[PDB]
Structures are given as structure tokens and as C-alpha cells.
Amino acid sequence: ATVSMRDMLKAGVHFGHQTRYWNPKMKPFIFGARNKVHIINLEKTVPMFNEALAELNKIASRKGKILFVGTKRAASEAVKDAALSCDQFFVNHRWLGGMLTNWKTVRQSIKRLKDLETQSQDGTFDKLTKKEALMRTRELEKLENSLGGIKDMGGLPDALFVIDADHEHIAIKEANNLGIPVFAIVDTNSDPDGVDFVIPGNDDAIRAVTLYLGAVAATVREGRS
Template structure:
């Protein structure tokens, strides 16, 4: 996981808040002061909170969890999509549909419809229907792709949610709180931090700032995946006992079960005794024949 420094935050403009007249008093502990009627965020408080949030994402993914990236405002759409794809996580970068999580059963039907249309488009089914019908189905697929394309491979409800602008994504936060999903959110000076489990005080409007947040979150997710891969590789390694001379000690064979050995012995003995019994019968028959001839 790449550690973000205070210098990087300064260069990205994370410390710039909103105009002082739009401030939210609940953000007062994270405000350093004001300059030119604009609040300045205290990065000395932002940096440790940011690190805690990234560590949480990493540990969540390492335990097999899924983090949903949410950023539907225009300045965040591209960064959210690119970095979520980079770390293999679901994302929503267009309008948040009401009930996307709380009514997930219905949303899954729309996702199934999207996948069916993608299959039809790929196997040439559109070529066997009229141009008008093909155009209508293509438009339907594009509309569903915009809304649900980022979550079509999501396996159920996510384990956490990373939000770029908590003021812009109020519906998503409400659904997450209703389902008990932890929320990691970037909170600017004009927003409230209520309902946010991991607060990141910072600029949520500048493209460079948003890119910094999302790239760090994607790196944290990849770090979590990498730790899982290392753990699996370590558990798969075989430990071989080595003698003092340097040669590997041969593996001990397991002793056969006693009952099975008895059965085998009895069978072999039976097979062995068979020809002897036949020979004895033949000798008896010969003696009887000699006695009769006398």
C-alpha cells in the first residue's frame, strides 16, 4: 500500500475547504483557519484519519470483503471507474438508483437483463431481428450499463462503502446505514460527518484531490488481495525434515491395519492349501484302486 504524505496532500489541494459562509459547525475540529473567506482544513488531523481508513480497507479486503466505490459527481466519475476496475472492486459512477442496496433483489433482475442483452449482442442475435428492435435493445443495454455496469459482477451486498462526496451521495449513505454497512467518506467543510464510520476531512471537489483518495483506496484494496495470495502460497508450501548431512529424510510409510493383514494371510493360506488337499485325495484314490485289483 502506497503511503500518502502531507506534501502530496498539499500538492493535490486537499487542504482547501469551501467558503466560510457555507461551513458546517460539526467540521470545526478539523478546520485550521481561513484564508480569503475559504476554510483551510488541518492536514495534521486529516493524515492519520486517512491512514486509518486505508488500513481498514486493506484489512477488509484481506478478509475476503468487498468495498463498493461510489462517486457519481462529474469530477469523480472517471477516477472512480478506473481505480475500481484496477483493484477489481464494484463501483457506481453515475446516478445512484434508489434501492440499489435496500432493494437488491429487484436490482439483480435488472442486472440479469443486462447480462442477457450483452449475450445477445455478442452472439449475433441482434442481426436476426429488425433494425428498429435491435436499436431499442441496444439503447436499453447502454442505459443499464451506465447505471448497473459497475455492480453487475458484485456478489451480493458489499462489506464496506467508499464515498468521495458524502453530501452528494446522501441516498447511498442512508441505504448503507440501514443495512449496517460501514462507510468511508471524504467530508468537506460544508458537510456533516454524521453516519460516516471513517471520516476523511478534505477537499471533495478538486479532481487532483479526488484522484489521490481513490488511487490510495485502490492501492489499499490491492494490498489486501496481495496479503491473501501470500498467505495461500505459504500454506501450500511443504515442510521437509532435513538430516544433519543435508539429505532430506525419507517419509515414513503408514503401517498397514492389522485386520486387513489377517484377511490377506488367510486368503493366501487357503490358496496354498488347495493343491495339497488335491494331492492327498489323489493318493487315497490310488491306494483304493490297488487294493481292489488285489
């Protein structure tokens, strides 16, 4: 449902970027500057985080398909487990340019993953030679590394969850073109114009992103009840 302010300092969600890379549009969401490092205003994010979680909850109550987005090293594996914990979908390694705006052409690539999976469990690769069986399994390995989170998708997402918004500005722009509401974790270096429901928080720490991922995988499941 909601979390307090005491655990905010434990995860370091106020530990933003320096006074060199900050975005000018972070003035309503910066508490101050400690040793030339901007501190995220923790009194401003806690009313804005819970209204997004209730915004993420009722869309999940109407059988909403939530998509998770994050392609950074610190949160590449944490975003995969959080989506499956709440029975949702994820994008973890690489966001393909045109994954949502060009949804038609990537579906042939999605079924191009499915026929390789049906050729994996039944025992089909073993009849072919060494060269053919190696590359089509190597083409397989690249496939669910970038499309395995959305191989169960079958449509356009109802809502979008974004980590490292400035690093994933392509994903936010793609959902904005189709009118899909996004849920981005904006840090001091990021731009929140594309973000419909702004959540100011630190995104460069493993323990910080798991606090959001743990909370967003928690808020979905009672909407499933």
C-alpha cells in the same frame, strides 16, 4: 500504505468551501479561513486517513467486496479506473434509490443487463428489424452506465467508499440501514454522522480525488496477497 503532508498542498486537499456553505460540524476538522474560504485541518486528517486504509485493507484481506461511489463530473471517470485497478466495483453515473436497501428488485434489473449482453456477443440483434434492435441496444446503453459496476457483484458490499458525501447522502444512508461500514471523503459542506470512518478532505478537485482513489486502489492490493 500512507502518504506524507507535502503532497497534500500539491493536490489542494485543504482547499475546502467558503465560509458561506460550511457545515457547523466541521470545527474539529478546519484549520482556519483564508480569504473567506475554509482550510481543512491537514494535521487532523493524516492520522484518520491511514487508520481507514488499514481498515479498508484487512476487510479486503478476508475476501471483502468493496464498492466505490461517486457521481460528480470531476470524479465520474476516475472512480471507474480505481475500482478495476484493485479489482473491485464502482458506481459512477447515478446511484439508484434503493440500490442496497432494495437489493432484491435491482437484481432482476442486473440480470436484465446480462441477457442483453449475451445477446450482443453471439450476434442476436441482427435478425430483428431496425426499430427493435435500436431500442433494446439503447436500453442496453443506459444499463451498464448505471449498473455495469455492480453487474459482477452478486451480494451486499462489505465496505463502501463514498466521494462527495453530501451529494451521495442516499448511498451512505442505504449502507447505514444495513450496517455496512462506509468510507466517505467529507468536505467542509458535508455531514459526517453517517460516516463510520471520517476522512476530512477536499472533493471538488480532479487531482485531489485521484490522490484518495490512487491510495485506496493501492491499499487493497496487498490484502489480495
